[PDB]
Amino acid sequence: FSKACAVETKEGNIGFDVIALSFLVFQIRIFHSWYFQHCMVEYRSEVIL
Amino acid sequence: VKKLHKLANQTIELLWRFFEVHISKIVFVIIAIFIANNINALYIPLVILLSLAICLGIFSLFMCAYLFLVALSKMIHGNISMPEWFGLKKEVEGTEPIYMLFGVIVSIIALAFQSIVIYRQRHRAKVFPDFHHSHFDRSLKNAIQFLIDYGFYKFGLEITMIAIGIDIFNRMDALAAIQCFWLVLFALNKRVFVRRIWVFYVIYMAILYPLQFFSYVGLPPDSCIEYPWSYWIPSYSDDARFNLSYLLNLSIYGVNWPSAYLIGDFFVLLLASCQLAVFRREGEDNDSIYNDGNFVIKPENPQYDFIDTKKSYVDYFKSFVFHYGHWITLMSTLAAGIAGTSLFALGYIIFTLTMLWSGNNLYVMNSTLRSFEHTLKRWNALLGYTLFTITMK
């Protein structure tokens, strides 16, 4: 039965997802922090206007 | 000669200032490694008392005498007998009593290192007493001091979450399931919810640690009794029963529990203790700026502009981390999505493509119609989907 369904070797890991979660939680924490209002001020009226 | 002597004096002073606050952590790590080396039965009282000490100079001498008792002891269905299961293996006579025990006697000196500073101090909690974070960007040395002094007050919640994630990664059991359920509960709420629930979480895990170690050590071999959890399964092979027991982390005869679990939960203990220690001295720095409830730019900020006046390199570092960090995190999430092979990978792909498709037009605070609030709603949806993915896996 394991031969028939034939999972590749073992690939069900919980790896790179963890570091992706780390990066995105860091980003969302930065989104609610300082220097980011200045960042968006730089985005606004210097890129479009 | 004089300059070298002054540099040596500065180095020894700074390492002493490091030690006077890090000897406790260093000795705890050393003891954890040593008890991971020997996971026999007689290690229950010591892990219990270390857990109690972490939960709370009266406690400083509790383990000092017991390690001497261990040093006293180390000098003293079947297939194994009482002394070996206890943790006292009768080695070959005539070889050595100190054959591989070169750290316990050093550990006594380690306790002395923690005791000499205590005795000579009472006869402040900062290595750098002239620290100033007002203009931390005016010097790279000041930036390093910021990273080493307030580096945990700033992001302690994040590093504790990382520790929990790595524990789940190296744990992979029902304990990992409850840990990721706690992660889901924590990540989907504001600061007040964790403010209220962290004490319950830390006491629950502090109580769970001793029970985990009791499960690890197990039962005496010649007890003339069989574990009930070895005969729940009616009509499946014995290997299935072994897998079920291992996944639920229950004691079984002739088990060889690796030290990775103990290392992970010990680091969880230390991160929780540090988080609580900084959590007592709570302030207003680790609070969201959206508590006022509007998305408009705050008229006056307590920090100067960083995009201009690019001086030194720490300003460049802030610009890189605050201006293109979302590109890095989207790269990481796309790599994680493409690494896997499942419908969860497809969800990651579609979410990251629809996130990257809105480059800059959607990053505008122009009143309503998908403003900053909707951007944070989408990001919270990303958090929810990622936690759903990990818990489902």
Place this chain on the structure above:
Amino acid sequence: LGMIKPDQLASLNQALTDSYTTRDTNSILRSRMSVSYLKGYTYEDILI
């Protein structure tokens, strides 16, 4: 003494290529090496 019939060679190839377990990684390399070595000779270069 004679050249191996194609049926026997095909049966031997199938038996060699189905000799592994789905758990250990090193068995994959051994089976791959055996199949690759066998594939170097056609049915004309092998005799019985």
